[PDB]
């Protein structure tokens, strides 16, 4: 990174740290939270890589930045199937019509078990990829299969913790 | 669809009619009001017996000929006098 | 003879819903609503289907709308006239079949909140009940009566927009309910998680879920309290106090809960 | 979810242990199981909040000192007076001993019970509670949270669940046991009614927390869902029910409505009244005016109607007078009765007095058990033999703590204990983690076809007019008071109810949310529980706790202090015959901190 | 095979309160306001 | 209509598909950008407009109070009404 700012290591290791706990206490659910902060994340994760740099086999530091990466990366990969299972819900609603009525009802969404499929596959491999971060994925994509689950019937291996 | 008077839709308007056109009416009204004593004060109606006999003396006072004057009744209370020779 | 009109959907057939009117003799059917119900599956239409159990209203498992306002069809009183009786399920809900709606979602995030008494220290050997005062205790007295019959999930408009992101006047009630709680330790912890955009703050002080409590309880009240107790006791380091409970659930079974 | 072709579509699950029933008793297993570290999966048809137990006013048991100093011992000697010398002194010492514990567990979980002055939890007198072996007066034992001791109960033991992070199968309807051919349970099969599908259970033990059969009698107080499930499962599998005679009147409840009205408004200082306006309660158990055994108030209040002393315009019904007690504590203690009052009756309790009139309330019989809440399938050579693999706790089942007659209070402290008992009793038995179990071949054959052919059954009798018929004989031939020859009368018209299921029909063939089919397969249930407590009270040639008999006014302890076990001779109700067999009463306490209690007068 | 309905939007049939009305006045005063704003605006413009 | 299949998710915050979310997030950035870009002109009307009656008031300080120190007789009724 191109900066001039120099940090010692205890204000490197609070900066870490802070940026840690706020990636992974923000409520993930909500799409404008990510929306309206994950380009705050991303200047401040810069400038924290950029100090941690020469820290990244300390034995406290370390350990840091390697949670605060891979929290990153989880809330990347949620974020983007969440989005998908979004789209979906808006289809289904849009194909209501107006005031539910079907007054100028859209046309349905045709492979709606495909898609359901597909996004419960893709909800077992962030379980598998982000083993440590189950509390935030069933946050966000389990509880979007669940509203899914709604709509359509069908079975996910964890259909039955979500009263289905 | 199930449509009940007492229904949200229909109720939500009512209360809606009647707690805002009363006010934007009034409003509106004072607006216009301040409108009016603006209009007023810059170009006030004045009524005229004969339009022939003003016609002749708003003539004279201005030095216009008759002539190159075209007069013109817009409505039945409203005549509109203009200069013929206009680009 | 009272008229009462049933709203009706099979779930293999997938047709239109429609409503489908039943004459009833009021003379051999019992005040409230749900014996008109049960007459008519017993007599007329066996196939009506709807969930029912107490009859004393303390289960909440016959939630309903009558006439438009939700309520308990046990403690719903009939009221006879010309005008037809119009019954059909919560608002805004999936139907599974006729009038029994679908109310995962309000149970999942009744889950989430972790309604279950929390304490630093595990109790020590010898140690009887925690010490609570009656006046501590009579603070919840409005709240721990709910019997999640989601009457007042269904009515508030802000839930008919935003049912899988904002929680709901029922189970922001219960929220409430153990923050209150003199013997929970972790008030912060709550506070912390419940103070969300979408989860606590989608209410715009509608009032329809107070009016339709079968109970009588009043969460819109209960709601109030619990916005001004957390924007006074806000502080910089509640984001960082909600990751270390996530780290502390990293174990835990799918599911929804605290995160 | 696995997926196989039993006609219909068919899901295989394998779990260490399966509980059947959402209850209190229930919900403490599954708690409990999941603590030891077994792999759990609790099925019910209902939202677990919304099981009957919410419906519990009055409270649990419990031999602290909050109010008075008490023991345990005390709480036992009055449980087996209760029982009417029926119990098995060994399950009550177990539960009275752990009824503190328990108590003070559930508080711990956060249940909102009132409290004292000191801030301890409040406790409340209940009838049929006494203090020094009897010689000392009334105890307040029944911790309580005002008049909705149930409905905490079941959300603390709901969030109980939820802390553990129990996997629940809701809104599933549970269809016969799986049985091995040499006499193990290895599971259950059940329908779930969101989706359609049928799901396979198998788990190495299972434990039965249904309800009770209350619903089989017109006027109860019973829910529309307790329709004794779990005990009609284990008669279609052979094995035995246990003293299904013994069916509890509650003294106080709504008339007509049929509503509870907690005995903590006689509790609290509540008297009944009839026609002349006298506390006719003084004549019958006049040490205990009020606060007599529940068997004994009904059958009271049952004769002074037959007197005509009753009140009302019929002279249907007796009064109960909560008007003079302040209106504060009214409020305070017993909040739930005023608004029930209020609607149901259109009384006001404060000023007016309530109509009453006794009604089935609870049934102590249920599935054989021991003390570690083991099912029972008893044999000559021995009493006490245990099916290997099934277990039994709440309402469903019948470990004799309760005997001819129930002390109120007491069930909601057998729900916990034996809810807890349960599940330490697995945990012993299975480990942690042990090979899955292995199905049988033919696993849900039989009930798939019983199931299809009721979906499928056309006939002129509907489910309706058949379970009216079947409430209309139980109501009035097995009344509070049983005569002989009305039962012998009642025992021929229930086998020819038994025998017209065959002609059942349903219209609807549906298989999600078919309430009509699911109230089909519930009737079969009600009505076979219901045969057997004819037979079986008919067999009772005496008068003990809640069965009395006018020919038999008298309690026969020489040749009649036996459980009595019923049996349902082929899993069809259609083709079957009940045979009735007994086997003795467990006398003996297991420890010596109780001692044992002889048979004496049952007075009160 | 089974698949479940959807209901319309309540407000079509829901019963109304009065606070429940207010509110939305509540809601709609700055709508109001901008309306009349633009109102007297066209008026200053096209009318005298 | 039949939505894709074969949808690629991101995998990490190095291997990321193009969703709706980020598509929200440009329309972030270019909200905030018209709202500096919109600044310019209340800031614009601020520092050009004047008010001033005619071009008399510049003469007259130009000849009768070149240093803004020239006191006047003070008569209220002038600017008073009355
Ligand atoms: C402490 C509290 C403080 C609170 C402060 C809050 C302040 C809020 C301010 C909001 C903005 C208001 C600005 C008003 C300016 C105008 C007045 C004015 O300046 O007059 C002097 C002066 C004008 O007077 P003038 O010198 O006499 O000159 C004449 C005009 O210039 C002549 O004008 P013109 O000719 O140039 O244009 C005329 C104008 C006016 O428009 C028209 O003339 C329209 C005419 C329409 C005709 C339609 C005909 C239809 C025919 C139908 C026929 C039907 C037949 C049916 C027959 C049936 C038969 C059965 O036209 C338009 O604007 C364009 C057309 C309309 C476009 C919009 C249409 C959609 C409307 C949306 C409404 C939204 C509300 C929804 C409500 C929902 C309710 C449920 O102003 C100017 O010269 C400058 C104008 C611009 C000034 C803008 C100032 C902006 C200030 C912003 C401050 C923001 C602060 C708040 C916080 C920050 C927020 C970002
Ligand atoms: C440390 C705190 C920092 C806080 C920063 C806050 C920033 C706030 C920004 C407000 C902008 C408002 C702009 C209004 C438009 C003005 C346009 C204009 O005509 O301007 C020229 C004119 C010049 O006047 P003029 O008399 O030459 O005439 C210009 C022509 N007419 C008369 C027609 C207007 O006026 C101004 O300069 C306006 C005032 C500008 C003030 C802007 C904010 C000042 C913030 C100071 C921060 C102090 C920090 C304290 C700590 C210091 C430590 C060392
Ligand atoms: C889609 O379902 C919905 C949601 O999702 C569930 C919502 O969340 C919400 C809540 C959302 C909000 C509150 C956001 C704000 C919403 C607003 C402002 C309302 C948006 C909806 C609308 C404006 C309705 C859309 C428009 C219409 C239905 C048109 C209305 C006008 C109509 C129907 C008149 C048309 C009539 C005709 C064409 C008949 C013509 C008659 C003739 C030709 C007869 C001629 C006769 C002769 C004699 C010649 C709503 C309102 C909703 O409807
Ligand atoms: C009005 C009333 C008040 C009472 N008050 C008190 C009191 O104050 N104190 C007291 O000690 N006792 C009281 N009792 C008695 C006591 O509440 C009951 O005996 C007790 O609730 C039984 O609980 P349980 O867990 O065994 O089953 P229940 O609460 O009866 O419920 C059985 C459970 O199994 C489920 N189930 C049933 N059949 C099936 C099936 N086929 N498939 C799947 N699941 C099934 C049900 O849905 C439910 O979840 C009262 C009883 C009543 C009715
Ligand atoms: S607040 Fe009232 S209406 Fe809402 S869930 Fe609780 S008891 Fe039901
Ligand atoms: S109706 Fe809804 S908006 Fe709030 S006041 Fe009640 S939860
Ligand atoms: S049936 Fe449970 S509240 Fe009415
Ligand atoms: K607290």
Known sequence: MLTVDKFTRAEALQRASNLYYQVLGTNWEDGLNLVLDVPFWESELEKVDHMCEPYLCDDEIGPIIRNLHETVNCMYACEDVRDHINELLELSSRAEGVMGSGAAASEEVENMPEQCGMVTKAYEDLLARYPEHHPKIEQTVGHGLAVLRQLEKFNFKSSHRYFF | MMLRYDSLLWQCTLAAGIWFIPQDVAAISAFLLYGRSKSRTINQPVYVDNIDTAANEYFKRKGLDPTKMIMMRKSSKITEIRYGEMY | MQTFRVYRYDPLLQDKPHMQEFNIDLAQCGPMILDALIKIKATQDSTLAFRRSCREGICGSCAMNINGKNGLACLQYIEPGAAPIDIQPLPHTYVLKDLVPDLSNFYNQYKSIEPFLKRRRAKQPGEKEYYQSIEDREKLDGMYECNLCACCMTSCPSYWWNPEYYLGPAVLLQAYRWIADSRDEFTTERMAWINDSMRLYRCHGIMNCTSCCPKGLDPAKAIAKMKAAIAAAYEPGWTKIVAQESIANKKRESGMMYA | ?604 | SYKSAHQETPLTYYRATQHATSSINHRLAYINAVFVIWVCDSLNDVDQ | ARVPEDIEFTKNRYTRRYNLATEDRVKLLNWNAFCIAVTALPIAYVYYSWYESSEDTDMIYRTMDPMREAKADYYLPLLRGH
């Open chain 4, 1 to 604: 979810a696995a997926g196989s072709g039993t006609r219909y579509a068919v899901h295989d699950h394998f779990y260490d242990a399966v509980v059947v029933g959402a209850g209190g008793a229930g919900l403490r297993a599954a708690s409990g199981l999941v603590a030891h570290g077994l792999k759990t999966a609790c099925i019910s048809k209902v939202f677990p909040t919304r099981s009957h137990t919410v419906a519990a006013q009055g409270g649990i048991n419990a031999a602290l000192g909050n109010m008075t100093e008490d023991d345990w011992r005390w709480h036992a000697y009055d449980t087996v007076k209760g029982s009417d010398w029926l119990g098995d002194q060994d399950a009550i010492e177990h539960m009275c001993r752990l009824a503190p514990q328990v108590v003070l567990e559930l508080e711990s979980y956060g249940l909102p019970f009132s409290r004292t002055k000191e801030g301890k939890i409040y406790q409340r007198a209940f009838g049929g509670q006494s203090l020094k072996f009897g010689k000392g007066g009334q105890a307040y034992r029944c911790a309580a949270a005002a008049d909705r001791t149930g409905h905490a109960i079941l959300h603390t033991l709901y969030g109980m669940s939820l802390k553990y992070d129990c996997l629940f199968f809701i809104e599933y309807f549970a269809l016969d046991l799986i049985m091995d051919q040499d006499g193990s349970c290895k599971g259950v099969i059940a329908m779930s009614m969101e989706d359609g599908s049928i799901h396979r259970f198998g788990a190495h033990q299972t434990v039965i927390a249904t309800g009770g059969y209350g619903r089989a009698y017109q006027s109860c107080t019973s829910a529309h869902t307790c329709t004794g499930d779990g005990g009609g499962m284990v008669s279609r599998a052979g094995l035995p029910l246990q003293d299904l005679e013994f069916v509890q009147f509650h003294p106080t409840g709504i008339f007509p409505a049929g509503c509870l009205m907690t005995e903590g408004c006689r509790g609290e200082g509540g008297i009944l009244r009839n026609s002349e306006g006298e506390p006719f309660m003084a004549r019958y158990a006049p040490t205990a005016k009020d606060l007599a055994s529940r068997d004994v108030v009904s059958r009271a209040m049952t004769l002074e109607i037959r007197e005509g002393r009753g009140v009302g315009p019929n002279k249907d019904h007796i009064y109960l007078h909560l008007d003079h007690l302040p209106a504060e504590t009214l409020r305070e203690r017993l909040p739930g009765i005023s608004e029930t009052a209020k609607i149901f009756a259109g009384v006001d309790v404060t000023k007016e007095p309530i109509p009453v009139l006794p009604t089935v309330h609870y049934n102590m019989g249920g599935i054989p058990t021991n003390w570690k809440a083991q099912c029972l399938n008893p044999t000559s050579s021995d009493p006490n033999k245990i099916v290997p693999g099934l277990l039994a706790a709440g309402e469903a089942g019948s470990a004799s703590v309760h005997g001819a007659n129930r002390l109120g209070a007491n069930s909601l402290l057998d729900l916990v204990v034996f809810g807890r008992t349960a599940a330490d009793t697995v945990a012993e038995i299975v480990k942690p983690n042990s090979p899955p179990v292995t199905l049988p071949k033919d696993a849900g054959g039989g009930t798939i076809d019983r199931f299809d052919k009721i979906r499928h059954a056309k006939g002129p009798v509907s489910t309706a007019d058949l379970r009216s018929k079947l409430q209309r004989t139980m109501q009035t031939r097995a009344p509070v008071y049983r005569n002989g020859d009305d039962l012998k009368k009642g025992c021929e018209e229930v086998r020819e109810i038994m025998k017209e299921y065959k002609d059942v029909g349903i219209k609807d063939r549906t298989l999600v949310w078919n309430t009509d089919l699911i109230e089909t397969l519930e009737l079969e249930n009600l009505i076979t529980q219901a045969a057997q407590t004819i037979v079986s009270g008919e067999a009772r040639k005496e008068s003990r706790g809640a069965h009395a008999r006018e020919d038999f006014t008298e309690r026969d302890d020489k040749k009649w202090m036996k459980h009595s076990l019923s049996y349902q001779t082929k899993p069809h109700v259609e083709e079957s015959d009940i045979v009735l067999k007994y086997r003795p009463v467990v006398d003996q306490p297991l420890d010596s901190e109780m001692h044992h209690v002889p048979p004496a007068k049952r007075v009160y």
